[PDB]
Amino acid sequence: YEHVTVIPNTVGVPYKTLVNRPGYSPMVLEMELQSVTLEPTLSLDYITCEYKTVIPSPYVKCCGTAECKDKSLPDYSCKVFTGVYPFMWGGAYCFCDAENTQLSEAHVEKSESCKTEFASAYRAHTASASAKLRVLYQGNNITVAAYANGDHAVTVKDAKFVVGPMSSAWTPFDNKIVVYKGDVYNMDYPPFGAGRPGQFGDIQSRTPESKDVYANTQLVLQRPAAGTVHVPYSQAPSGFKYWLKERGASLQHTAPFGCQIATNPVRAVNCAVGNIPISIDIPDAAFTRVVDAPSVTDMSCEVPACTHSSDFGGVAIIKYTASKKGKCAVHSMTNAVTIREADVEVEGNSQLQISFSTALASAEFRVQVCSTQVHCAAACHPPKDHIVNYPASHTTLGVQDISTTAMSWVQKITGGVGLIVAVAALILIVVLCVSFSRH
Amino acid sequence: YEHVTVIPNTVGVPYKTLVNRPGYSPMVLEMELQSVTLEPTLSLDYITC
Ligand SMILES: *[C@@H]1O[C@H](CO)[C@@H](O)[C@H](O)[C@H]1NC(C)=O
Structure with missing residues (x-):
């Protein structure tokens, strides 16, 4: 199998790249x-x-x-x-x-x-x-x-x-x-x-x-x-x-x-400066058929606390149930958040903890594991430090950002009176249409 | 971590002050x-x- 990706030209920042192949368990590789x-x-x-x-x-x-x-x-x-x-x-x-x-x-x-x-x-x-x-x-x-x-x-x-x-x-x-x-x-x-x-x-x-x-x-x-x-x-x-x-x-x-x-x-x-394209031809030997991987069910997520920072300040606890003991990859499909861990062993009706980094004030994201999705919602808080020595580019946030509760506020603000003004204009123009025909 | 509080000027009356820190279990201290x-x-x- 051949997979192609591109990564920012940066040193010391781990990058997760999730290669998926139908008929086999998808796998996510860490490149530094x-x-x-x-x-x-x-x-x-x-x-x-x-x-x-x-x-x-x-x-x-x-x-x-x-x-x-x-x-x-x-x-x-x-x-x-x-x-x-x-x-x-x-x-x-x-x-x-x-x-x-x-x-x-x-x-x-x-x-x-x-x-x-x-x-x-x-x-x-x-x-x-x-x-x-x-x-x-x-x-x-x-x-x-x-x-x-x-x-x-x-x-x-x-x-x-x-x-x-x-x-x-x-x-x-x-x-x-x-x-x-x-x-x-x-x-x-x-x-x-x-x-x-x-x-x-x-x-x-x-x-x-x-x-x-x-x-x-x-x-x-x-x-x-x-x-x-x-x-x-x-x-x-x-x-x-x-x-x-x-x-x-x-x-x-x-x-x-x-x-x-x-x-x-x-x-x-x-x-x-810039970025790098990488093409990896991976023999199927590493690939494992989906049936080989243990199944997963009864997925619940919770965040006891999280703290948007340059480090892995976010911690998430997930309750899971699986068919049998086995390894299983874990990934986040939203670029706004990154996960330090790559895979994990799953035994069955148990739980696990994961350490991640984010930048959103409120972290609302899906997480993929064993070809299954689990939601996760939390409200992070600002740390105390304003500047750090080690580099960390994983938590990148664009102009688009989560207004969190204030989102609703703007959603409430978005309400306008244009509908009523258009209604008034329509009413007046019709009551005039008695005398206004086609002009 | 730094926490600041104020307590009435009284003697013999225990006072509970709850300091909380995200990412860790909050803890409440008794001061007399x-x-x-x-x-x-x-x-x-x-x-x-
Ligand atoms: C790979 O590098 C990380 C970097 O700290 C290290 O913790 C780990 O033990 C190394 N070996 C692995 C992941 O097998």
Whole structure:
């Protein structure tokens, strides 16, 4: 047998789905979402890290002049100066008072630290869904894992489960993302080869190991301090290290629906959006012919007390009489109320208790068991607490709601005098019809 | 659970107060006044003999 259902995309909220098959006892299964993972694409746009500035020993000269020869290196720069008269510990370096010259040059390269610490920019666009389910089958909890895209089919305990596709294509991610060691950020990185100094992307590297790099750091030299031998540099401050200082809030806090985000691999998990379709092919072995199930008769219901709450605040006692000892499923056919229990053993002329959750001020509903219906009417009361920690979406109430006793009040209010006014209009128009024929 | 009540200021007369809580069996408590003491201020104006 094949059964298809749909459930809200929520985690930790048990769901009852009643599959019925003529000629056999109908059975209701409990399905729970352990977690749902969304794996986005991974197109590594590039990486970046802190840079090291290499400035070899400056070239000094006397009574002669140096010269700049271009170097095919990133952001390589050079300069010359004249008239410098450096002094060392033992005295002047050389005699030429002003005929001397100084040549300096520098460049910037990647740091070995990049091999361990860095920030990587990807252009992830799409994603795939995988999920974990817990199912109450034959009186035991069973775990299943499958891709929640409507394609993956999984066989367990002789039954075939298919999940997905996700109703909503929404994702918390973005086309372009930047990832640190364990943090993710939605942020539009500058295009490769156009890094703006002092900002993210100031140095661009294709891979942590690729020797080729790109840089933009305005490396300008300056005239050295008089009387000293040294090289000054106007090295641009590293925007990469700085961006780590102003990273801002991570996406695990800014993600709508709070989809928890992990790494290695990067996934977004546990966000409630849309719903999921599930198709279950269940072999008939689990199915039991109706004759096998014990009968039921003399059904009475009572509610000693009930309390509409996020928990199972409602308790109902039912008196039942059955043919023989045996298991029997229990369900509520009204979505406004949910029942924690799935089935129960029935011996005969006995009673039982059931714990349920509702949201109506007055709970008036039918309950199905052993292919029989029993009414239940009660007046719940508001609990004391206004907010709770654990989640509970079972007790969902639409705009339609039970006015309870006040229902009668509005039923009494609905009475109007339109009938009498129409009667008066008819009477006047007829007594006029003596003179009013067809106008 | 919190319950508030008021009882006449009298001694030796038992009082029944029924506290009820939905979802549980209501319970009625017996409260009796053994005695009530009023201690006034003490500002010794003076003494004599
Ligand atoms: C299934 O999970 C529920 C959750 O609390 C647990 O109480 C129960 O013992 C588990 N096993 C079953 C229902 O067989």
